[PDB]
Enzyme design. Structure first.
Site, mmCIF file in Angstrom:
data_model
loop_
_atom_site.group_PDB
_atom_site.id
_atom_site.type_symbol
_atom_site.label_atom_id
_atom_site.label_comp_id
_atom_site.label_asym_id
_atom_site.label_seq_id
_atom_site.Cartn_x
_atom_site.Cartn_y
_atom_site.Cartn_z
ATOM 1 N N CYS A 72 4.478 -2.599 -23.197
ATOM 2 C CA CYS A 72 4.406 -1.556 -24.209
ATOM 3 C C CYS A 72 5.606 -0.615 -24.135
ATOM 4 O O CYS A 72 6.037 -0.193 -23.053
ATOM 5 C CB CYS A 72 3.090 -0.789 -24.087
ATOM 6 S SG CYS A 72 1.643 -1.876 -24.250
ATOM 7 N N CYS A 153 3.464 -3.430 -28.844
ATOM 8 C CA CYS A 153 2.532 -2.342 -28.627
ATOM 9 C C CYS A 153 3.208 -1.031 -28.262
ATOM 10 O O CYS A 153 4.245 -1.016 -27.576
ATOM 11 C CB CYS A 153 1.486 -2.756 -27.587
ATOM 12 S SG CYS A 153 2.106 -2.923 -25.947
#
Ligand code: AVU
Ligand code: NAG
Length: 238
Positions: A72, A153
């Protein structure tokens, strides 16, 4: 037979060597992956098949052995800015598709097979425009990119070319495959970067970037756009 260049010589040694290098020296630590089996699956995806009948499904198993998924907040997309994007990613310790296991394997390689042969065609491969789009080279990149975008993400960044008339090309892989499949509720930062010594021919306010904002709205992805930056200003300071 085909109009495209033939397969990279010793393709399977290369993908196995790169696999060992990547999993042991570049990005180790996680779970182990067997590089022999990854090479075998990669080869089995296309070897001895009609070179113009590739489907996304031919690669599901290969991808499942090593999905192109980046931590992420570290993910970087690009379009018409490959080398700039890679420099930027390297400096900032981020990752482009070329920094995933499978992208690293495949980067800059060509491959195709031939029906009834267990070997790569090293003399010619189908050209995307002159032969067929449904070839193993182009299809690999489209499916890997799709999975790359689906797994994104938190904050993701994209580097686009502000020296082209349309920094966002809706017929590009970024335009057709990545942006429209981007996991919902991530946030995207775009940087439109122009050639040193030339005024920019596209900006955040331009038509093409408006199309991208539209796509991101539909995915409920927040968008921040920055433009009017030279490669130097961008790199020296994002
Ligand atoms: N690592 C690679 N190595 C070799 N070829 C590649 C690679 N990645 C993509 N290609 C191929 O080269 C072509 C590049 O076309 P552009 O117009 O410059 O840019 P986009 O199409 O937007 O692809 C880039 C984005 O999509 C995926 C992410 F990597 C990027 O964020 C493409 O059609 C592929 O067949
Ligand atoms: C900042 C950047 O990536 N600029 C690129 C340049 O390298 C390339 O020659 C041109 C044509 O594709 O697109 C622009």
């Amino acid at each position: 037979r085909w109009h495209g260049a033939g397969s990279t010589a010793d393709f399977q040694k290369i993908i196995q060597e790169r696999c060992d290098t990547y999993t042991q020296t570049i990005r180790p630590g996680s779970r182990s992956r067997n590089c022999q089996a990854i090479r075998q699956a990669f080869m089995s995806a296309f070897i001895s098949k009609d070179p113009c009948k590739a489907t996304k499904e031919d690669y599901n198993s290969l991808i499942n052995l090593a999905p192109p998924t980046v931590p992420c907040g570290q993910q970087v997309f690009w379009s018409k800015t490959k080398e700039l994007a890679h420099e930027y990613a390297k400096r900032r310790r981020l990752m482009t598709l070329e920094d995933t296991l499978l992208g690293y394997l495949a980067d800059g390689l060509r491959w195709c097979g031939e029906p009834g042969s267990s070997d790569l065609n090293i003399w010619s491969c189908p050209d995307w425009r002159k032969d067929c789009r449904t070839n193993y080279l182009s299809v690999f990149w489209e499916v890997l990119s799709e999975r790359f975008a689906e797994s994104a993400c938190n904050t993701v960044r994209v580097v686009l070319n502000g020296s082209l008339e349309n920094a966002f090309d809706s017929m590009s892989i970024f335009g057709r495959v990545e942006a429209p499949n981007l996991r919902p509720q991530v946030e995207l930062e775009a940087w439109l970067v122009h050639d040193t010594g030339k005024p920019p021919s596209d900006s955040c306010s331009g038509s093409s970037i408006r199309k991208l904002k539209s796509i991101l709205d539909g995915r409920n992805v927040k968008f921040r756009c920055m433009d009017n930056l030279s490669r130097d200003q961008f790199l020296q300071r994002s």
